[PDB]
Write a protein that binds this ligand. Structure first.
Ligand SMILES: NS(=O)(=O)c1ccc(CCN[C@@H](C(=O)c2c[nH]c3ccccc23)c2ccccc2)cc1
Ligand SMILES: [Cl-]
Ligand SMILES: [Cl-]
Length: 317
């Protein structure tokens, strides 16, 4: 292969995740399984500027910063089936480091999560996604991020997160499974002493004695900005946090004393400037354009190829 998944530029994140997976796979000793290559394909710096009315209430009065500088990263899992690569799992993340003011100091928030259900074998499918996610929650806990945040949100019909045109027979999870599927992922992270504990947003906030909306983390296109702005008031937020708690996790990686003695986070990985994988829209555009689909396996093997072709010559700029 001239343009293969492996032959993409490596990173310390990319190598850390693909290790834990092949480590997990090799011990399972299923003969159908194959090599999983994990790559970071976009890393850049960004901010999430506070919205007009939250701004007016707290930013203008001095009590809150006007924006929060995070690093965005896009990363993809590729299996080798029939001796050809298959992009099976993508993930977009916001990383708010130590130099970020509160209340985004040392937090990761997963922008987006997606899959194409042709990972082999299909019994290890869900298991492998869990490794990639615990592997990311482990990686960042070691760099020294205290808290992770997940919006447990299933996709809508007629719209896709990352991959254009999913398999017709790959069913979307109903809210209650997706919640159980994350709880499934986390309870395993807890047993490996990676996660200290996790809580729904309401319980976390009930136990952190939050008395102001400026204390609630403020992520890019997360639910809670839109709620606070549509609210324009602490009660209103305790109503909404309570009603929706089950969808919004707070994953504590570093706890108690060890959280206050932290040296500053230093991401060792360099920035990967990539036009295509800057947010979800530009990649969905290219796939729509060039008639690409992840509908069938052979179609998905086609698409990963034309995805990599485009990636290797946009890096070469
Ligand atoms: N709870 S579960 O055990 O069923 C399960 C299994 C695997 C996964 C891994 C991620 N999978 C995607 C996903 O399927 C889809 C995204 N866009 C779609 C459009 C049409 C049909 C499907 C998709 C996904 C699903 C939910 C939320 C984000 C991304 C997740 C959950
Ligand atoms: Cl998601
Ligand atoms: Cl983005």
């Amino acid at each position: 292969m001239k343009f293969s998944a492996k032959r993409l530029p490596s990173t310390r994140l990319g190598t850390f995740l693909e290790n834990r997976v092949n480590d997990f796979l090799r011990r399972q000793n299923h003969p159908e399984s194959g090599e999983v290559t994990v790559r970071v394909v976009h890393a850049s710096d960004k901010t999430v500027e506070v919205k007009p009315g939250m701004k007016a209430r707290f930013v203008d009065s001095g009590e809150m910063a006007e924006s929060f500088p995070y690093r965005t990263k896009a990363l993809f899992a590729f299996e080798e089936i029939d001796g050809v690569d298959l992009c099976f799992f993508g993930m977009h993340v916001q990383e708010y480091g130590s130099d970020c003011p509160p209340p985004n100091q040392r937090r990761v928030y997963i922008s987006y999560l997606d899959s194409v259900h042709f990972f082999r074998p299909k019994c290890l499918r869900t298991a492998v996604y869990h490794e990639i996610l615990i592997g990311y929650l482990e990686y960042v806990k070691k760099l020294g991020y205290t808290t992770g945040h997940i919006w447990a949100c299933p996709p809508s019909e007629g719209d896709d997160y990352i991959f254009h045109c999913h398999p017709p027979d790959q069913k979307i999870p109903k809210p209650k499974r997706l919640q159980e599927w994350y709880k499934k992922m986390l309870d395993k992270a807890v047993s490996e002493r990676i996660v200290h504990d996790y809580k729904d947003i309401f319980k976390q906030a009930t136990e952190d004695r939050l008395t102001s909306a400026k204390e609630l983390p403020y992520f890019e296109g997360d639910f809670w900005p839109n709620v606070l702005e549509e609210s324009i008031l602490s009660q209103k937020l305790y109503a909404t946090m309570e009603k929706h708690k089950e969808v919004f996790f707070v994953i504590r990686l570093i706890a108690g004393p060890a959280a206050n003695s932290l040296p500053p986070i230093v991401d060792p990985d360099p920035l990967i400037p990539c036009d295509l994988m800057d947010g979800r829209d530009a990649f969905l555009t290219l796939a729509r354009d060039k008639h690409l689909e992840f509908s069938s396996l052979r179609r998905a093997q086609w698409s990963t190829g034309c995805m990599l072709v485009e990636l290797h010559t946009q890096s070469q700029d």
